Design a protein around this ligand. Structure first.
Ligand SMILES: Nc1nc2c(ncn2[C@@H]2O[C@H](COP(=O)(O)OP(=O)(O)OP(=O)(O)O)[C@@H](O)[C@H]2O)c(=O)[nH]1
Ligand SMILES: Nc1nc2c(ncn2[C@@H]2O[C@H](COP(=O)(O)OP(=O)(O)O)[C@@H](O)[C@H]2O)c(=O)[nH]1
Ligand SMILES: [Mg+2]
Lengths: 438, 157, 424, 36
């Protein structure tokens, strides 16, 4: 009917994609083998999950997912884990040597040896689609494969699948879990070259997730396991609309129509509520009014920034659970009045709303509590330029002395590619400044 | 039996309570929920309506045939397409002409749902209606009639 | 994936043996070669330094080279002597006589052909060879002279592969031409190695009589082996940070010429001692010059990039608080133009005997004090052209000594350039 | 083998050498930059 193919590139890409597929199965009634037995299924008749899962003659539902990594240790856990029989071996692709946190090795030197097999495995998936919508691409910014190989794959998907949408989930770096000093370099390099290829990109700041884990989940020193559990809970809120019957963001096309009025400024900010610790003492379930209000607290955002020093281009609210439309209309009126939210001059001011009545799902045993009703706000604020500026300033500091540049030059990339990418970033900063003027 | 409790919840003031009562009435496919889910097909909320349409396919009562044919005119694409698949499941030849018209819907999912519901109904009304459509009709309806006739031949020719 | 190790010279083989005795105990491999360990964490990354032999036997990926037979007979005798592959012992019966020119062009070029054959044999077994690791002294003949020859031959045959060295820097604290071989070796190191761990002999001696009466070779070697096990923990055990030689260099080397690291280790232990060091106690000692394997003071220079490894069971939150405090209270000695330059790794497995430790690897510009000493010592013997006839007769060029001394002085001039560099 | 034991002497040894007493290509400075 209208399928979506998900692509997971590098460690972060593969690890978050695996946590997402685990939650999808739980949401749809799919077992780790791929079966959907009568007992496990929601008896509502909603078959929209077929956009993410293909079906075999034996009734096995298979994720339309491709996992790529230049090194095998991450994908070998997927091949061995609980979901070893969920994906076909053909969908799990591994190199032998990784990009050593170098954008140039993933894009040029090493990436070029695997790009044609990756496109072949993607074409195999695409062939089973009667009406493919496009792609959801999961990757880090700071790693050499997640940055370098992703931009190479994005460049090629545009050519081989011209009329198809490309949505990203990008892992934005943080010092608490940083593995490389060159991450600002890779982050700025993948942004410049991917910019015209993606239609909508959702940045996941590792620091924002770290803060939410420490503060709402009471996790003292969060590890990737903790982070990916909250990341997947949130990313699944953003993708739900694609996998279930609904009236908002039902296709990849609708994400730009509802969220992206200006193409370069295509980085919406996501705010998820409520994030509750499974270990918390009894509390009354938080109301539509309460969860809607949490959407405007910058502590609940998955990118560290302040929309109160910035303007809006778009705002979507995707509600899940025991959510009464009359209670949502009443709560949005309170936000449109008692809250001082400012839109950019040539965009309508309305807040788009979606309500899926099925109860929210969490992974049994994890850090998160099962809530009665939840919300994900997707908003395109100019405030997100704060996250760009932080990466740009760190890039400027090292590039002022040509520190570590030699690694990139000696791996197929030209020196002028650094300054050209930084120019595109300076132009993007100015674009955000131009749309916010009064 | 929580059937009576779920039937009363179908007329609750809260739309997600009405929805979850329709989902549960489909799992507990009882004849006591046929008139109640037929009424939920006139629900103000499309999500309750589309779930009532599926729940009525599951029960398979002949009583749901005429209100599921009215649901084929519904404003919402999920209500039209789930009503089509419910009528395919009931298999009543009373749905053959409204399902052929649903082949011309602007919604792709509604067209596919109606094409597949006609193939699940079968019989002589569908045989005759496809023979006519594969000669006098065009487009999706024509490919559906041709496909129906090809998959139903007793010989190789 | 695989690291091929090479041990050139008497010091290179002596430290090479102490390295294999320490990592073989850590991985559970007994002196015969069989796995006598207890956890599957010891075998997860065993392929980095060992080859799976017939049965549960594991053979070190090590090649032993020396122009004198004595060290090959001494390596065979003692612990883990019977673990090395018999055919990997390349030993000439002539000798080096402690000359770089003799080891790089005369007796070295005769044996280097047969050494490269053994290198090829182990590299052919490799599924995805990571690079090379060479242990050697810089004041002798075999280690310093034939070592810099082996690096250049391998850099031509395996150009992509990461070259790494554990280079022992000579100190007068008895050979006349010790700074001549050292200045010529460092010249090669600047152009051919990717990571050079400077193991200064002056620092080992100072940390044995001032901190720890007459120190022995094995006493200096005890500090060396405790350093080598720490800097290689990230390669031998499953980890996120600097898990390979290339990922380590991409975080530790900002400028190609500046790949000269300062090792550090806490707590300081003597060879045979009977307190359990805490995380804050480990952190101050990790950045103190009294705990440095190179005789330099980091308060006189700025760190460009740092790598800290904590071993044993401790709070990761307590290491976070201490590593942030050591960088905030001393930010005056950190480079502003290299954001987040300090990377910390924590391994649950502790080193031999101790329950908690901290191994530091710092690329600081304060290392120009070690290279300043070598320039002040080489130009003292070059002031009157002292004993140049011992290296001239071996076939070396006159302008070779002038290029080794000028390239090293350029390295010091580059270290001061990046020390006085304001980000502003 | 763990039992192996440990300025003006250099000045006196230089004077002692004075009483008694095939150009091979070497490495170029800057040649290490060729690998990048
Ligand atoms: N949230 C999260 N971040 C991760 C995870 N793994 C790595 N990262 C982050 O991603 C960045 C490093 O990129 P990786 O995904 O490990 O790299 P890669 O794409 O495999 O690249 P190479 O390993 O160099 O080939 C850093 O900013 C890490 O903090 C993960 O599972 N979750
Ligand atoms: N740490 C350490 N240094 C040593 C040892 N033996 C010699 N050295 C040092 O190595 C240098 C002499 O080089 P050497 O290895 O003996 O000569 P080669 O066999 O010709 O390479 C001097 O700076 C010595 O102090 C040893 O066992 N341990
Ligand atoms: Mg990786």
């Amino acid at each position: 009917m209208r399928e979506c193919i998900s692509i997971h590139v590098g460690q972060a890409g593969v690890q978050i994609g695996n946590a997402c597929w685990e939650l999808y199965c739980l949401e749809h009634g799919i077992q780790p083998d791929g079966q959907m037995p009568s007992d496990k299924t929601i008896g509502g008749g909603d078959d929209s999950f077929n956009t993410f899962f293909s079906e075999t003659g034996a009734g096995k539902h298979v994720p339309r997912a491709v996992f790529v990594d230049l090194e095998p240790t991450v994908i070998d856990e997927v091949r061995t884990g609980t979901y070893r029989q969920l994906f076909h071996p053909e969908q799990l692709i591994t190199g032998k040597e990784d990009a050593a946190n170098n954008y140039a090795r993933g894009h040029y030197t090493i990436g070029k040896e695997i790009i044609d097999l990756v496109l072949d495995r993607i074409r195999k998936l695409a062939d089973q689609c009667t009406g493919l919508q496009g792609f959801l691409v999961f990757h880090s910014f700071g790693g050499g494969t997640g940055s370098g190989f992703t931009s190479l794959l994005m460049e090629r998907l545009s050519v081989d699948y011209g009329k198809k949408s490309k949505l990203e989930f990008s892992i934005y770096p943080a010092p608490q879990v940083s593995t490389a000093v060159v991450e600002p370099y890779n982050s700025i390099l993948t942004t410049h070259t991917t910019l015209e290829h993606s239609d909508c990109a959702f940045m996941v700041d590792n620091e924002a997730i770290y803060d939410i884990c420490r503060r709402n989940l009471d996790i003292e020193r969060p590890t990737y396991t903790n982070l990916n559990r909250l990341i997947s809970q949130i990313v699944s809120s953003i993708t739900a609309s694609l996998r279930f019957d609904g009236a908002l963001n039902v296709d990849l096309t609708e994400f730009q129509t509802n969220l992206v009025p200006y193409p370069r400024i295509h980085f919406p900010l996501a705010t998820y509520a409520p994030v509750i610790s499974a270990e918390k003492a009894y509390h009354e379930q938080l109301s539509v009014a309460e969860i809607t209000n949490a959407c405007f607290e910058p502590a609940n955002q998955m990118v560290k920034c302040d929309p109160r020093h910035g303007k809006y281009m778009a705002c979507c609210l995707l509600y899940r659970g025991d959510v009464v439309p009359k209670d949502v209309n009443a709560a949005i009126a309170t936000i449109k009045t008692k809250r001082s939210i400012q839109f950019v001059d040539w965009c309508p001011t309305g807040f788009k709303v979606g309500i899926n009545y099925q109860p929210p799902t969490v992974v049994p045993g994890g850090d998160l509590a099962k809530v009665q009703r939840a919300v994900c706000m997707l908003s395109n604020t100019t405030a997100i330029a704060e996250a760009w500026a932080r990466l740009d300033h760190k890039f400027d500091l090292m590039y002022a002395k040509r520190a570590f540049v030699h690694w990139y030059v000696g791996e197929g990339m030209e020196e002028g590619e650094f300054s050209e990418a930084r120019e595109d970033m300076a132009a993007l900063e100015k674009d955000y400044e131009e749309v916010g003027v009064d | 039996e929580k059937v009576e409790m779920y039937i009363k919840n179908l007329q609750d003031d809260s739309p997600p309570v009405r929805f979850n009562a329709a989902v549960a009435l489909g799992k507990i496919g009882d004849e006591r929920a046929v008139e109640p889910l037929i009424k939920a097909l006139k629900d103000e909320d499309w999500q309750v309506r589309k779930t009532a349409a599926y729940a009525l396919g599951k029960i398979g009562d002949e009583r749901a045939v005429e209100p599921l044919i009215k649901a084929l005119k519904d404003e919402d694409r999920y209500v039209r397409s789930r009503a089509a698949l419910a009528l395919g499941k009931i298999g009543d030849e009373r749905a053959v002409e409204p399902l052929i018209k649903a082949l011309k819907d602007e919604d792709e999912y509604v067209r596919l749902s109606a094409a597949s519901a006609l193939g699940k109904i079968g019989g002589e009304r569908v045989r005759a209606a496809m023979e006519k459509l594969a000669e006098t009709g065009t487009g999706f309806a024509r490919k559906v009639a041709v496909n129906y006739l090809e998959t139903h031949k007793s010989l190789i020719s | 994936r695989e690291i091929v190790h090479i041990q050139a010279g008497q010091c290179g083989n002596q430290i090479g043996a102490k390295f294999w005795e320490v990592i073989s105990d850590e991985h559970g491999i007994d002196p015969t070669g069989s796995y006598h360990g207890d956890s599957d964490l010891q075998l997860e990354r065993i392929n980095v330094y060992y080859n799976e032999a017939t049965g549960n036997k594991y053979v070190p990926r090590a090649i032993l080279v020396d122009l004198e037979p004595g060290t090959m007979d001494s390596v065979r005798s003692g612990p883990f002597g019977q673990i090395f592959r018999p055919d990997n012992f390349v030993f000439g019966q002539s000798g080096a006589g402690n000359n770089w020119a003799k080891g790089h062009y005369t007796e070295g070029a005769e044996l280097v052909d047969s050494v490269l054959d053994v290198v090829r044999k182990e590299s052919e077994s490799c599924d995805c060879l990571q690079g090379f690791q060479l242990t050697h002294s810089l004041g002798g003949g075999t280690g310093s002279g034939m070592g810099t020859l082996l690096i250049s031959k391998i850099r031509e045959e395996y150009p992509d592969r990461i070259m790494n060295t554990f280079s022992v820097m000579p100190s007068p604290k008895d050979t006349v031409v010790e700074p001549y071989n050292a200045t010529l070796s460092v010249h090669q190191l600047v152009e051919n190695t990717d990571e050079t761990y400077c193991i200064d002999n002056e620092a080992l001696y100072d940390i044995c009589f001032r901190t720890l009466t007459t120190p022995t070779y094995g006493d200096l070697n005890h500090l060396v082996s405790a350093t080598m096990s720490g800097v290689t923990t990230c390669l031998r055990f499953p980890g996120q940070l600097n898990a390979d030689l290339r990922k380590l260099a991409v975080n530790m080397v900002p400028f190609p010429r500046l790949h000269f690291f300062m090792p550090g280790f806490a707590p300081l232990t003597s060879r045979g001692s009977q307190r359990a060091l805490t995380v804050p106690e480990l952190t101050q000692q990790m950045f103190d010059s009294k705990n440095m394997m190179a005789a330099c003071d980091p308060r006189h220079g700025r760190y460009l990039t740092v790598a800290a490894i904590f071993r044993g069971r401790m709070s990761m939150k307590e290491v976070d608080e201490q590593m942030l405090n050591v960088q905030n209270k001393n930010s005056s000695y950190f480079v502003e133009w290299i954001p987040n330059n300090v990377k910390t790794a924590v391994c649950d497995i502790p080193p031999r005997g101790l329950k908690m430790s901290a191994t530091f690897i710092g690329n600081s510009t304060a290392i120009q004090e070690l290279f300043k000493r070598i320039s002040e010592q080489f130009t003292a013997m070059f002031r009157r052209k002292a004993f140049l006839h011992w290296y001239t007769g071996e076939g070396m060029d006159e302008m070779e000594f002038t290029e080794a001394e000028s390239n090293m002085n350029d390295l010091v001039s580059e270290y001061q350039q990046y020390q006085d560099a304001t980000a502003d | 083998i763990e039992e192996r034991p440990i300025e003006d002497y250099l000045e006196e040894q230089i004077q002692l050498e004075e009483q008694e007493l095939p150009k091979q290509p070497f490495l170029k400075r800057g040649e290490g930059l060729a690998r990048f």
